[PDB]
Amino acid sequence: DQTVCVTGAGGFIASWLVKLLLERGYTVRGTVRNPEDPKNGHLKELEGARERLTLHKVDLLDLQSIQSVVHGCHGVFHTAPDEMLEPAVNGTKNVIIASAEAKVRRVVFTSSIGTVYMDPNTSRDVVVDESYWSDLEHCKNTKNWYCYGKTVAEQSAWDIAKENQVDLVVVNPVVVLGPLLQPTINASTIHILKYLNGAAKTYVNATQSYVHVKDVALAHLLVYETNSASGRYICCETALHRGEVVEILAKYFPEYPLPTKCSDEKNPRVKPYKFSNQKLKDLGLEFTPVKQCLYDTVRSLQEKGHLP
């Protein structure tokens, strides 16, 4: 019987989260930049959206704008690189401050695996869990502005939440794959697209951790619903080298072009990071295997016409 707020409701993760919340009977206030815009139009079509979903024109940098939407909510899902940092941090601060004033039960903040593992002391041989934090200096040294900014934002979230005695929990997803609802999506899917359209006949010597978007959504809800949820939550399935991704696509989609070799055959295959998803498993989350993530991604690229 609850009302919840979802910020940036039209994004990749957020849309699937909205979908999930509507299926579980939640009443949803999705905040967007412009409600009557086409790129948001897929939300209004979701099962239950007619009855229980409203979209709201909200500017997160305007405190009163988010405040009026947050009042009445039991929960807030805040789902939302050098130039974006300060405004993102300011918008998050406003969400947290507004949540304190509205007396919501809990705020769920979408972060990233990038705030977890980017520290020189963090090897690819240790099992990395939620106790690991990235190194701001090391991120800065290496122009890793993604990891720097995510790390700053998440530290800011904790501090602002702590100042206001707001119950905040955080999800840290790895690379997110799966079916699309809108028509865009990340650099990995773009690489996968470039495999399957023949633009890329080689693959790089790199690894990556993947997770199904539906799992990410489910992780968000689990950490909102579970009274005992606390802290950070790594959201990952398993990691694959690029060559392993190619071999999977080859078994499922043998008719399509794929790269024929690694662009680096002189060095040994890079080993992946070992991330623990035990915290979410303990709350009872069962992860969709990565093979199925890749499958659903490609089907969606087909259905949406990005793939000839």
| CATH number, domain containing residue 209 | 3.40.50.720
Contacts by 85-90, CB closer than 8 A, 24 or more apart: 85/148, 85/149, 85/152, 85/153, 87/61, 88/149, 88/153, 89/152, 89/153, 89/156, 90/60, 90/61
List the domain range (segments joined by +) for residue 4: 1-308
Tell me the structure's resolution in angstroms, rounded to a single decimal.
Answer: 2.2
Q: In what order do the strands lie in the sheet containing 207-212?
A: 175-177, 207-212, 238-241
Which residue in 120, 87, 122, 109 sits closest to 154, CA to CA? 109
What's the total number of domains in the chain? Answer: 1
How many Å apart are CA 252 and CA 162, to the nearest integer? 48
* CA distance to 3, 171, 206, 244, 281, per residue, from 272 (Å): 40, 21, 8, 12, 21
116, 172 contact by CB (below 8 A):
yes
Q: Whole-angstrom Cα distance, residue 260 to residue 244?
A: 12
Helices 242-252 and 290-303 pack at an angle, to 10 degrees, of 60
Dig out the tokens for 157 from the structure.
Answer: 């979230």
Task: From the candidates 19, 93, 150, 279, give the one annotated as an active-site residue.
Answer: 150
Residue ranges for the binding site for NADP(+)? 8-14, 33, 39, 59-60, 79-80, 146, 150, 173-176, 188
Q: Which two tokens stand for residue 21?
A: 């919340």
Residue 52 and residue 28 in contact, taking contact as beta carbons nearer than 8 Å: yes
Binding site residues, as ranges?
8-14, 33, 39, 59-60, 79-80, 146, 150, 173-176, 188
User: Known catalytic residue: 201?
Assistant: no
Separation CA 157–CA 231 (nearest Å): 12
